[PDB]
RNA sequence: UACUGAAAAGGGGCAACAGAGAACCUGGGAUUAUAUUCCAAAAAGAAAUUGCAUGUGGG
RNA sequence: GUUGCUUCACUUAUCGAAUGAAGAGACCAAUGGGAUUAGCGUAGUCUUCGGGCUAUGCACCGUCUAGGUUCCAACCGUG
RNA sequence: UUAUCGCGUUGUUCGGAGCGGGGGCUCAAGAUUGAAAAAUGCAGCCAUUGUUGUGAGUUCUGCGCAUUAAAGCAAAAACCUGGGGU
């Protein structure tokens, strides 16, 4: 405000007060213990799926089509006490998302399938 | 054994060392409102100004200005708290005495506000009137010296509506009128009236005819002087 | 009727300049304090050709007057300019081919190019290849210089206008016959959509 | 410890599945139909590359 | 005393150009300003008696310089 | 230390502004060792086999950046090195 050393005037720097966090506008009760049930829908029992259970230690599921691989892994850990080493996904021509899930060979996919009921 | 401290000056001539950062204020691009508020003053200086508007650039001196502002300050109007306290005391007096007058006149003070000051001038109650010289729009007070001259009321034009507002306790005042003072300030008011009359009322013939403006810039004046000197002979 | 072709060309449309391969506009440097009071020294860095233009262009490097950096200028080169040459621009500059001087310092009878009609417009007259202006006379009472233009007209300009000494390079370009329609095709490919030309009597009354 | 406040002229964005850019290769007895995408600890195997943390040497 | 036409010298409306609005003009002084930078004389003239207006002087705003010459100083010169 | 003279291409050229010879320094493209890798693949049938040379054609690449030309052959992100001071 005394001696300017540029050929054009630019806006001076003033004090800015940060905004406040308002009370939330969404007050619907959402349980945090049921999301895995939305993520993992049900298994598949086709011939290819059956062939993968025994020889590749792999299970096949229909999942929510907006889910990603990391959350599918976490949902597997929550719903069944198993550890997935690999998740592969595809979106079918009828619109549903399918997941091929390989277990860590310290668990038996056949025994997990028996417990699931398929 | 030998200090290695030395002078290592720089050359700032054309085509030499990179210069220090100079001050560019007089040659920079400013904001539009800055540029316009300077050019407005220049244009008001260069044009021919009629007397009715020119009279507002001829103000009262410094000493009389300060004295008059001091008098107005000592006769300033009462504030919100003071009015409330006085009215509450009047109310308790009336409560204890359902009879008897109450005398709710308020202490003597100056008259403030354009409507009330105009009324005091027109009814010839004002002993002296003070007018600010920078009211915008100027038509609000442009006629007041003529009214005061017509009614033979002493008046002055002073430098700031902000200073008048400070004297009376507000942000701004366009004009102020003194109608009466205490017995101790009579001499002050009389001397102030004499000086004010000397400057304004007693020079009405000049004030009504004198024009203003027509002021060249310094660069134009210097050019004219140098040309006159050059063409001598 | 229907719109005539000469009027249609004013809409812009498919008749604008083919500019994608061009370098920038060619100008002298800005008339600043150093040029008004002293002089500046630059170095010629390269000589190049641009599509659509017969004359050669020169990239010239100067030092920035206020900051620590280098400034590159692009000018229309006079005949004889070479890479590595030193160029002087300003009030006190010697009479040599390629230097830039105020018109009031150039002796009568001298040949100039890149002349600005008004001071500080950075060069507008005598720019096409092989062209130049001649300085006729000065007038100190009114500070004005008289020039003979390439067209043969005379013009008076303020004596504070600048000009480069010499002649635009690339002269003699129009003296070689073209001989082929394809050569004209390649010549106008770098300029704009104006060739071939159909005679008006070969058209129909509607247009 | 967030906060706070010196420098840096020329607001924000879109437009190329043939331009620029781009860290992975072969073998398979591995399908009815997909694969440089699948194969399980002898990963049939051999690599390259990004982020963040351990420790070993040096600053 | 007004009005029209018209010459010339000006600059603040307006118009053209340049630039990242990047160094304008003075200080070298008036046919210049001032009571908040009009302070003081001289003559006439006016006054609401407090002081004005006109004319002409004196103050003040008033200042620094590379170089070229002849320790200072001065004359040139003009950033 | 060369000179009318020497060096070189199929080809339109190079040299006291440093030719040629003797010794070196670098860059590009190949080659040759190994590791990977026989544990693989192929073909006859718990065993056998297991390939090395010459022509021709192919645009990667190199011939570094002289095709007509009044035609002279995009840009930026991202990245690399230096000059300065830290
Ligand atoms: Mg996929
Ligand atoms: Mg265009
Ligand atoms: Mg016809
Ligand atoms: Mg017709
Ligand atoms: Mg895009
Ligand atoms: Mg591409
Ligand atoms: Mg990719
Ligand atoms: Mg197929
Ligand atoms: Mg080729």
Q: What is the 3-state secondary structure (H, E, C) of chain C?
A: CCCCHHHHHHHCHHHCCCCCCCCCCCCCCCCCHHHHHCEEEEEEEEEECCCCCCCCEEEEEEECCCCCCEEEEEEECECCCCCCCEEEEECCCCCCCCCEEEHHHCCCCCEEECECCCCCCCCCECCCCCCCEEEEEEECCCCEEEEECCCCCEEEEECCCEEEECCECCCCHHHCCCCCHHHHHHHHHCCCCCCCCCCHHHCCCCC
* Method by which the model was determined: cryo-EM
Say how many CB pairs under 8 Å bridge A and B: 22
Give the closest-approach CA distance of A1 to chain B in angstroms.
10
| Backbone CA torsion sign across A70, A76, A81, A87 | negative
Token couple for A105: 């060979």
C partners (3+ CB pairs within 8 A) are B
Q: A3 and B23 in contact by Cβ < 8 A? A: yes
Strands C39-48 and B155-158: unpaired
Q: How far is residue A2's CA from residue A29's CA, in Å, rounded to a whole number?
A: 59
Place of tokens 């049921």: A34
Residues C106, C147 contacting (CB under 8 angstroms): no
Q: How far is residue C28's CA from residue C74's CA, in Å, rounded to a whole number?
A: 8
Q: What is the DSSP-derived secondary structure letter of residue A67? A: -
**Chain B hits for A7, Cβ within 8 Å:** 24, 27-29
Question: For residue B68, what are the contacts with CB-CB under 8 A and spacing of at least 6?
Answer: B60, B130, B156, B158, B192, B196
Q: How far is residue B170's CA from residue B174's CA, in Å, rounded to a whole number?
A: 11
Q: Is any Cβ of chain B less than 8 angstroms from the Cβ of A9?
A: yes
Q: How far is residue C136's CA from residue C157's CA, in Å, rounded to a whole number?
A: 12
**Chain C hits for B15, Cβ within 8 Å:** 34, 38-41, 63
Q: Which residues pair with C78 in a beta bridge?
A: C168
Spacing of A55 CA from D29 C1' in Å: 15
Residues of B at the C interface, defined by Cβ within 8 angstroms: 13-15, 18-19
Q: How far is residue A98's CA from residue A90's CA, in Å, rounded to a whole number?
A: 5
- Most C CBs within 10 A among B10, B13, B18, B26, hence the mutation to make, goes to B18
Place of tokens 């202490």: B107
Token couple for C85: 């040459």
Residues C23, C48 contacting (CB under 8 angstroms): yes
Q: A7 and B21 in contact by Cβ < 8 A? A: no
Those nucleotides of strand F lying less than 7 Å from any protein Cβ are 69-74
Q: How far is residue B110's CA from residue B73's CA, in Å, rounded to a whole number?
A: 9
How many Cβ atoms from other residues are within 10 Å of residue B159's Cβ? 15
Q: C37 and B18 in contact by Cβ < 8 A? A: no
Spacing of C46 CA from F24 C1' in Å: 37
Q: What is the phi-psi region of residue A99: left when phi exceeds 0, alpha when psi lies from -120 to 50, beta otherwise?
A: beta
- DSSP H/E element including B63: helix B62-74
Strands B212-213 and A84-91: unpaired
* Angle between helices A47-56 and A109-116 in degrees, nearest 10: 130
Q: C39 and B19 in contact by Cβ < 8 A? A: no
* Residue A102: closest CA among A67, A65, A54: A54
C183 carries a ligand binding annotation = no
Give the closest-approach CA distance of B15 to chain A in angstroms.
20
Residues C164, C90 contacting (CB under 8 angstroms): no
Please compute, for residue B107, the number of CA atoms within 13 A of its CA located in the half-sphere on the CB side: 12
Q: Is any Cβ of chain B less than 8 angstroms from the Cβ of C38?
A: yes
Please compute, for residue B214, the number of CA atoms within 13 A of its CA located in the half-sphere on the CB side: 6
Q: B24 and A9 in contact by Cβ < 8 A? A: no
| Backbone CA torsion sign across A77, A81, A84, A85 | positive
Query: Nearest by CB to C38, which of B15, B18, B19?
Result: B15
* Residue B179: closest CA among B131, B121, B125: B125
Give the closest-approach CA distance of C17 to chain B in angstroms.
35
Q: How far is residue B172's CA from residue C112's CA, in Å, rounded to a whole number?
A: 67
What resolution, expressed in A, was reported for this entry? 2.5
| Backbone CA torsion sign across C46, C51, C52, C54 | positive
First to last CA, chain B: 70
C176 CA: nearest nucleotide by C1': F70
* Residue C82: closest CA among C71, C95, C96, C92: C96
Spacing of A56 CA from D29 C1' in Å: 16
Place of tokens 């792999």: A58
**Chain B hits for C63, Cβ within 8 Å:** 15
- DSSP H/E element including B54: helix B51-54
Task: Specify burial of residue A106 (Cβ count, 10 A radius: 0-12, 13-18, 19+).
Answer: exposed
């Amino acid at each position: 405000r005394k001696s300017y050393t540029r050929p054009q005037f630019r806006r001076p720097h003033t004090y800015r007060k940060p905004a406040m966090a308002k009370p939330s506008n969404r007050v619907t009760v959402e349980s945090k213990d049921i999301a895995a049930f939305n993520v993992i829908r049900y298994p598949l029992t086709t011939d290819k799926a059956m062939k993968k259970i025994e020889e590749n230690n792999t299970l096949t599921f229909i999942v929510d089509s907006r889910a990603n691989k990391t959350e599918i892994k976490k949902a597997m850990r929550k719903l069944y006490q198993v550890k997935a080493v690999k998740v592969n996904t595809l979106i079918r021509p009828d619109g549903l998302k399918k997941a091929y899930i390989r277990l860590s060979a310290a668990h038996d996919a056949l025994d997990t399938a028996n417990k699931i009921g398929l | 054994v030998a200090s290695h401290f030395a002078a290592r000056p720089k050359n700032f001539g054309i085509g030499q060392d990179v210069p220090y950062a100079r001050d560019l204020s007089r040659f920079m691009r400013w904001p539009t409102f800055v540029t316009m508020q300077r050019k407005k003053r220049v244009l008001q200086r260069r044009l021919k100004v009629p007397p009715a508007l020119n009279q507002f650039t001829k103000v009262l001196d410094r000493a009389s200005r300060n004295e008059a502002l001091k008098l107005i300050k000592k006769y300033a109007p009462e504030t919100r708290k003071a009015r409330r306290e006085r009215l509450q005391k009047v109310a308790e007096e009336k409560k204890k005495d359902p009879k008897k007058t109450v005398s709710t006149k308020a202490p003597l003070a100056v008259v403030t506000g354009l409507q009330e000051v105009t009324r005091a001038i027109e009814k010839k109650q004002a002993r002296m009137v003070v007018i600010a010289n920078n009211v915008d729009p100027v038509e609000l007070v442009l006629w007041m010296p003529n009214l005061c001259r017509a009614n033979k009321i002493p008046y002055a034009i002073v430098k700031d509506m902000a200073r008048l507002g400070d004297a009376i306790g507000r942000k701004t005042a366009t004009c102020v009128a003194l109608t009466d003072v205490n017995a101790e300030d009579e001499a002050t008011l009389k001397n102030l009236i004499r000086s004010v009359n000397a400057r304004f009322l007693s020079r009405s013939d000049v004030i009504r005819r004198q024009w203003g403006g027509l002021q060249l810039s310094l660069r134009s004046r210097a050019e004219l002087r140098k040309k006159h000197a050059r063409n001598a002979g | 009727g229907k719109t005539v072709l000469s009027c249609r060309k004013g809409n812009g449309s498919v008749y604008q300049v083919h500019g994608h391969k061009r370098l920038g506009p060619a100008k002298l440097r800005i008339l600043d304090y150093a040029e008004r009071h002293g002089y500046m020294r630059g170095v010629v860095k390269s000589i190049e050709h641009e599509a659509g233009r017969g004359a050669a262009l020169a990239r010239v490097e100067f030092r920035h007057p206020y900051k620590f950096r280098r400034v590159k200028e692009l000018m229309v080169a006079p005949e004889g300019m070479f890479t590595g040459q030193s160029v002087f621009c300003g009030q006190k500059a010697p009479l040599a081919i390629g230097n830039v001087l105020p018109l009031g310092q150039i002796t009568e009878g001298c040949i100039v190019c890149n002349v600005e009609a008004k001071p500080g417009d950075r060069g507008t007259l005598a720019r096409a290849s092989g062209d130049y202006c001649i300085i006729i006379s000065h007038n100190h009472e009114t500070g004005r210089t008289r020039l003979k233009l390439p067209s043969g007209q005379k013009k008076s300009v303020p004596s504070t206008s600048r000009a480069m000494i010499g002649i635009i390079s690339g002269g003699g370009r129009i003296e070689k016959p073209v001989l082929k329609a394809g050569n004209s095709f390649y010549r106008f490919r770098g300029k704009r959509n104006c060739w071939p030309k159909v005679r008006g009597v070969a058209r129909n009354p509607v247009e």
